[PDB]
Amino acid sequence: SECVLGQSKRVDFCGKGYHLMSFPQSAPHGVVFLHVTYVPAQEKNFTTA
Amino acid sequence: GKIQDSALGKLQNVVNQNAQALNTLVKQLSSNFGAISSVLNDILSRLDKVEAEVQIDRLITGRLQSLQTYVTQQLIRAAEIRASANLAATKMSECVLGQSKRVDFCGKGYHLMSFPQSAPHGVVFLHVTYVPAQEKNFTTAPAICHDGKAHFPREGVFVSNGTHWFVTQRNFYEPQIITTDNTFVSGNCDVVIGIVNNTVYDPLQPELDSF
Amino acid sequence: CSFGGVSVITPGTNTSNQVAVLYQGVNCTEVPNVFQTRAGCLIGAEHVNNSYECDIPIGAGICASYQQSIIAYTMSLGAENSVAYSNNSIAIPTNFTISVTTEILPVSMTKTSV
Amino acid sequence: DCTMYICGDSTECSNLLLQYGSFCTQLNRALTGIAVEQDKNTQEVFAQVKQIYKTPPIKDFGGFNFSQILPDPSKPSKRSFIEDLLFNKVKFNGLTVLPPLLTDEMIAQYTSALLAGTITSGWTFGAGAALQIPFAMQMAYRFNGIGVTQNVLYENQKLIANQFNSAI
Amino acid sequence: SETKCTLKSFTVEKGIYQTSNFRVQPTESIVRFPNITNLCPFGEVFNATRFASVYAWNRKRISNCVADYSVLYNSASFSTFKCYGVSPTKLNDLCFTNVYADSFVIRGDEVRQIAPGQTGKIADYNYKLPDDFTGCVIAWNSNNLD
Ligand SMILES: *[C@@H]1O[C@H](CO[C@@H]2O[C@@H](C)[C@@H](O)[C@@H](O)[C@@H]2O)[C@@H](O[C@@H]2O[C@H](CO)[C@@H](O)[C@H](O)[C@H]2NC(C)=O)[C@H](O)[C@H]1NC(C)=O
Ligand SMILES: *[C@@H]1O[C@H](CO)[C@@H](O[C@@H]2O[C@H](CO)[C@@H](O)[C@H](O)[C@H]2NC(C)=O)[C@H](O)[C@H]1NC(C)=O
Ligand SMILES: *[C@@H]1O[C@H](CO)[C@@H](O[C@@H]2O[C@H](CO)[C@@H](O)[C@H](O)[C@H]2NC(C)=O)[C@H](O)[C@H]1NC(C)=O
Ligand SMILES: *[C@@H]1O[C@H](CO)[C@@H](O[C@@H]2O[C@H](CO)[C@@H](O)[C@H](O)[C@H]2NC(C)=O)[C@H](O)[C@H]1NC(C)=O
Ligand SMILES: *[C@@H]1O[C@H](CO)[C@@H](O[C@@H]2O[C@H](CO)[C@@H](O)[C@H](O)[C@H]2NC(C)=O)[C@H](O)[C@H]1NC(C)=O
Ligand SMILES: *[C@@H]1O[C@H](CO)[C@@H](O[C@@H]2O[C@H](CO)[C@@H](O)[C@H](O)[C@H]2NC(C)=O)[C@H](O)[C@H]1NC(C)=O
Ligand SMILES: *[C@@H]1O[C@H](CO)[C@@H](O[C@@H]2O[C@H](CO)[C@@H](O)[C@H](O)[C@H]2NC(C)=O)[C@H](O)[C@H]1NC(C)=O
Ligand SMILES: *[C@@H]1O[C@H](CO)[C@@H](O)[C@H](O)[C@H]1NC(C)=O
Ligand SMILES: *[C@@H]1O[C@H](CO)[C@@H](O)[C@H](O)[C@H]1NC(C)=O
Ligand SMILES: *[C@@H]1O[C@H](CO)[C@@H](O)[C@H](O)[C@H]1NC(C)=O
Ligand SMILES: *[C@@H]1O[C@H](CO)[C@@H](O)[C@H](O)[C@H]1NC(C)=O
């Protein structure tokens, strides 16, 4: 419901990084979620106020 | 008015399994477990101690295993009730005392309100939800190019009725004119794909000209 | 030599007295309106092509219901919908329905001491 | 079958077991409960979609290549490649194993329906009608939910597609 | 009726109920034993002129021979015929890999000392039956002879 049929603001509920999409996949006796997430990269330092 | 016409089975299973568990525990008192009688008063009228003790030990063994089975069954089923109770507490917090962005946590559709109602050994939530209805197809675009600069919806989707272009909010069709209030600019319009051309309106441009 | 669970598929006795028997696992050759489900031989139910919604589970996709005779069918998962996806096309709701949906949760069981 | 397990074909053993009473039924009853719970568990995960959505034949999803996770058109089971990968990688004494209610193909149909809805209509098929949206615009609104302004998708769409295609 | 009976109810709700377990019960009874034609009995074991003394019990392997134990058990001579691990009524339904017959004499009230797991002079110092003895103890009066 929250990762496939929706997008989740819940940190780590739908993989590491900010959740975009999840795709369900069947497995024996189970389900596999391919959580697609936005992980930020290439930090730069800046002065802030 | 439709709730009068309408899940209780998932709750009645609690009432029915506790009833069946106790009833089975009572019926096992009729079981002989290899003793010459199911009723201990028979053993103790029929026999004297040195023989009764073996008979009583069989009844004790089978009754104590009946009761350990019951208490094991109840401990397992109590863990299931506590899962349901913690879920119900979370729904009370997040659906009644709040509004939930969690899809399908508070009924189908986008959650508005929930109201709790008491039930036997349970709680009933009346989840009020917005279900969108009466779809129309519209042509859409990710950006408008104007004067070589790419305009994007500030909060919404660009739609065309064939002739014109409008911004709407995503979850309900209210078409609004495309303006620098309804759109934001990022970059020149060459880099985006799927773009279209339409004249965004500045509110300053007529007002300043009206001076 | 072969053995299995004799499962009685029944409507409510309020509705009808007719019942069907699923002999789990065994093939109909060894049992003695006879239907070899992948759950076992089913006696007294009529096979129908129409994939209705599952009323009584049997197994391996077969379900049974009353329609009067007992009928057995490979259940439907739902109607089939291509959404008319196109790279230039959005659908927007022009209206809405407020639906009130009822969710019932256990909260306790009876306190017992023995 | 508690009697087949404890005794087999042995009328005297079966009769002695009757003196221990309902213990033979309680086990059949408890395992019946577990068994029906498994079909309930499977249904509550996969039957969240009430309508078997289908993908179009033209897979014009803005550069995103779902070919490993959508169904293979060449196969009768209609598994995806990653499902087919997973399903590869991972008697007489009165015991019996019962078939699940939903066959693996029915789980594939539901899994295909959830995926087709997701890629063609976003969250909307969950929250009601499967209102279609172009996939690039869906991703742009998913970006807007993570606090990243939606232009960051369209200006980097070929990169975002190539990263996703690599990750799959 | 089986459903109503297994639910302990005169009415049944819609469902599938595991009322019973069937089994394709056996049509006919086979019997198979080795085609051993020798009958060589315990005769020379029961009716020997002199037995062994108990300290040096005479052991004879009865083997490769048919043995009707009913004609033993029907003998009114056998004041004791206590059996262990097998019951006399069924001995004729069994076949055994070897049947050692051990024969000796002891005073009458001391016969009770022979049984497996007993202790005392015979069981301690002359002949001890193992606690997992499967077998039969045959004893009869011999003051008329010995
Ligand atoms: C998106 O559009 C399809 C196609 O509808 C056709 O094209 C439209 C632009 C308009 O001209 C319609 O009148 C055309 O029929 C929609 O599919 C139609 O749905 C209606 C029911 O609302 C049905 O009676 C038609 O037969 C369908 N047409 C076809 C060709 O299948 C579709 O419903 C729209 N998608 C969504 C999610 O609303
Ligand atoms: C698209 O929407 C616009 C705005 O509602 C429509 O334009 C109007 O059309 C009416 C006649 O139908 C004119 O009287 C108005 O002056 C128009 N307004 C503007 C701002 O141009 C347009 O007709 C719609 N087109 C379709 C195909 O529905
Ligand atoms: C959208 O608008 C841009 C800008 O007016 C159009 O680009 C111009 O098109 C003309 C005709 O081909 C050229 O002579 C100009 O040199 C173009 N300008 C630039 C900066 O490239 C563009 O063609 C329009 N697109 C559509 C689909 O209408
Ligand atoms: C939005 O949908 C509602 C519900 O169908 C519409 O309200 C009904 O309108 C009809 C007339 O068209 C009336 O006879 C009904 O009594 C109305 N129902 C209620 C509950 O008031 C409404 O007209 C639709 N609105 C739009 C703009 O499409
Ligand atoms: C999506 O990715 C798949 C896998 O790389 C591509 O399919 C392969 O294409 C090559 C070249 O035609 C074939 O030799 C392979 O056999 C294909 N693999 C499979 C599993 O079919 C596919 O072309 C990509 N999608 C697009 C639109 O290019
Ligand atoms: C952001 O990081 C990505 C990943 O390192 C960079 O993407 C690659 O860019 C090179 C050209 O510089 C291409 O040849 C590669 O194909 C790109 N990767 C993929 C997966 O397509 C990207 O250049 C970086 N962008 C910025 C602005 O730093
Ligand atoms: C030992 O000798 C006696 C006497 O000769 C045998 O006695 C027979 O025993 C069987 C079995 O009880 C009876 O059916 C016969 O009627 C007995 N015969 C007589 C004449 O009394 C005995 O068979 C011999 N022992 C064994 C083990 O064969
Ligand atoms: C949509 O797809 C067609 C091919 O069917 C392509 O020619 C067109 O450029 C695409 N348009 C957009 C906006 O993606
Ligand atoms: C039993 O049948 C009657 C009709 O004869 C119906 O009114 C009643 O509701 C039924 N009861 C149940 C429990 O189904
Ligand atoms: C029983 O029938 C099934 C098909 O329903 C078949 O696969 C199987 O080979 C048959 N025989 C046995 C012994 O299962
Ligand atoms: C069900 O389908 C088969 C073909 O797969 C057909 O032969 C049979 O007649 C159908 N059953 C009924 C009751 O029509």
Residue numbers in the entry:
A (entry chain C): 1030 to 1078
B (entry chain B): 932 to 937, 944 to 1148
C (entry chain B): 590 to 621, 641 to 675, 690 to 736
D (entry chain C): 737 to 826, 854 to 931
E (entry chain B): 297 to 442
Study text:
S glycoprotein trimers protrude out from the viral membrane and are the major proteins on the viral surface, making it the main target for vaccine design. Sequential cleavage of S at the S1/S2 site followed by the S2’ site within the S2 domain exposes the fusion peptide (FP), which mediates host-viral membrane fusion, allowing entry of the viral genome into the host cell. Overall, the S-trimer structures are similar to those previously determined for B.1 in situ, and are similar across all variants.
Alpha and Mu have a P681H mutation (681PRRAR685 to 681HRRAR685) at the furin cleavage site, while Delta has a P681R mutation, making the furin cleavage site 681RRRAR685. The efficiency of furin-mediated processing can be ordered: P681R (Delta) > P681H (Alpha and Mu) > P681 (B.1 and Gamma), in broad agreement with other studies using authentic live virus particles and viruses generated using reverse genetics. Delta (34 ± 14) and Mu (35 ± 16) had more prefusion S trimers per virion than B.1 (20 ± 10); Alpha (23 ± 12) and Gamma (27 ± 13) had similar numbers of prefusion S trimers as B.1. Taking the virion diameter into account, the density of S trimers (per 1000 nm2 surface area) in Gamma (1.5 ± 0.6), Delta (1.9 ± 0.9), and Mu (1.9 ± 0.7) is higher than in B.1. The majority of S trimers from all strains have all three RBDs in the closed state (hereafter, closed state), ranging from 73% (Mu) to 88% (Delta); the Mu variant has the most populated 1-RBD open state (hereafter, open state), constituting 25%. The D950N mutation induces a structural difference between Delta/Mu (which both contain the D950N mutation) and B.1, indicated by >2 Å Cα RMSD. The fusion core at residues 936–945 in HR1 has been reported to be critical for the conformational change when S transitions from prefusion to postfusion and we speculate that the D950N mutation may modulate this transition.
